[PDB]
């Protein structure tokens, strides 16, 4: 990869444009000082192990698993930050959606995706720890929230922590990202009332 890490590539960092059906690579050469990693500051959980799985993976096909238009009770193109601009305009990651409240309400998300493909899918999603109670209610209305993610082999119940950070590129909040492998005919279940960074695009993968 040119100037992007692996997380910034999989998440769709606007800086990176390596996508579509990106050709069956013969493993990946990534610089250790990845120019543009995450837009926001934060951690990409189990980056370690995902890098080992991407070793035995040769080909990728991006697919849309949950249309961005289906979040019609939330705002879906308001979550933008200067952390990462597309032109000079503040943008966000393409493959994942930052859901904001719509008109002082954040209805509770409770939604499933079933992998009806023949390949395993690599799915990515995030959580937002907001700076202050002010930013929390400003972005998500509900002061006390949760994220809940389930498959047949995964069980997440997260609670985002209000806490003011040391600013990295002008933001005192952070975003953590997670990933899993959904087998054919298994389903991933999402449920949240705030702070959820939702998937839109996942990746079909075949191994050895």
């Amino acid at each position, epitope marked *: 990869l040119r100037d992007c890490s692996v997380a910034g590539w999989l998440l769709g960092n606007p800086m990176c444009d390596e996508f579509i059906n990106v050709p069956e690579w013969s493993y990946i050469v990534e610089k250790a000082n990845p120019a543009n990693d995450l837009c926001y500051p934060g951690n990409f959980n189990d980056y370690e192990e995902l890098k080992h799985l991407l070793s035995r993976i040769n080909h990728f096909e991006k*697919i*849309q*698993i*949950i*249309p961005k*238009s*289906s979040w*019609s*009770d939330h705002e879906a193109s308001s979550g933008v930050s200067s952390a990462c601009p597309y032109q000079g305009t503040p943008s966000f990651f393409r493959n994942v959606v930052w859901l904001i409240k719509k008109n002082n309400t954040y*209805p*509770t*998300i*409770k*939604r*499933s*995706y*079933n*992998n*009806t493909n023949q390949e395993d899918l690599l799915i990515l999603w995030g959580i937002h720890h907001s700076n202050d109670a002010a930013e929390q209610t400003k972005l998500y209305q509900n002061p006390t929230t949760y994220i809940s993610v389930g498959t047949s082999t995964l069980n997440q119940r997260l609670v985002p922590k209000i806490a003011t950070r040391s600013k990295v590129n002008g933001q005192s909040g952070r975003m953590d990202f997670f990933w899993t492998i959904l087998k054919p005919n298994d*389903a991933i*279940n999402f449920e949240s009332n705030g702070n959820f960074i939702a998937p839109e695009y996942a990746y079909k993968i075949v191994k050895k």
Partner: antibody, heavy 117, light 110 residues
Framework: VQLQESGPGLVKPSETLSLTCTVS????????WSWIRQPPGKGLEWIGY???????KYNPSLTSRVTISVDTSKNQFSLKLSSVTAADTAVYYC????????????WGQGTTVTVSS | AVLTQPASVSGSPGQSITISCTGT?????????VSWYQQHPGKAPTLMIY???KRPSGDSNRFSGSKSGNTASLTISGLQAEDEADYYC??????????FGGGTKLEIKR
């Protein structure tokens, strides 16, 4: 999984049509749930659907008259269509789907409603 | 909304026939969520194809879907008398709605 429509099959003009779908052998939760109608000898028309915990989206041509609601504890969801006219005489179907299917996999058998005095 | 489908198509037993379904960029074009339903009269429609080309079961073995531009197509090979039905396409849209086509009566030429 089975779906069954329930409610009165004869409604007076300008009154409100009320229907309920009872889900058997499976749960409401995490699926999305839709109402569709078919006037006699005509084609299918999407009325709207309910998704997530209780969010809805309706067909633009009917959205001012329709309410779709859910009752997870009874494993039912419901349709209300207000100020009905003869153009609402139809067979009404409830249906299920989910992301990754992206259409409608299980349908009720349909229930006939006629708008008339 | 209503996608555009021929009102009817016709075929002899054994041959292949195709049904078209034309929408715009905001439904058929941009998404891969076109389904096809088969309906006999007095019964509920039955899902025969989803995500443009996936089959729910062996009943769809002879059915095959594709998409090109804003026009989806359904092909039925080895037409059988029992394939007689109304066929409807459907698409998710960018308004978080679904739309149906007008329906195609499939006639068996005997």
């Amino acid at each position: 999984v089975q779906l069954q429509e329930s409610g009165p099959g004869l409604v007076k003009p300008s009154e409100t049509l009320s229907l309920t779908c009872t889900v058997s052998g499976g749960s409401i939760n995490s699926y999305y749930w839709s109402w569709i109608r078919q006037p006699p000898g005509k084609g299918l028309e999407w009325i709207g659907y309910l998704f997530d915990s209780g969010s809805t989206k309706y067909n633009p041509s009917l959205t001012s008259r329709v309410t779709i609601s859910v009752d997870t504890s009874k494993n039912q969801f419901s349709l209300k269509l207000s100020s009905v006219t003869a153009a609402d005489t139809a067979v009404y179907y409830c249906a299920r789907g989910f992301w990754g299917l992206d259409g409608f996999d299980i349908w009720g058998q349909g229930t006939t409603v006629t708008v008339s005095s | 909304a209503v996608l555009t489908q021929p009102a009817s198509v016709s075929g002899s037993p054994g041959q292949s026939i195709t049904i078209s379904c034309t929408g715009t960029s905001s439904d058929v074009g941009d998404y891969n969520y076109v389904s096809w339903y088969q309906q006999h009269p007095g019964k509920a429609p039955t899902l025969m194809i989803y995500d443009v080309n996936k089959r729910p079961s062996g009943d769809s073995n002879r059915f095959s879907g594709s998409k090109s531009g804003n026009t989806a197509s359904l092909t039925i090979s080895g037409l059988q008398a029992e394939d007689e039905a109304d066929y409807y396409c459907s698409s998710y849209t960018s308004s978080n709605t679904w739309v149906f086509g007008g329906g195609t009566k499939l006639e068996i030429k005997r």
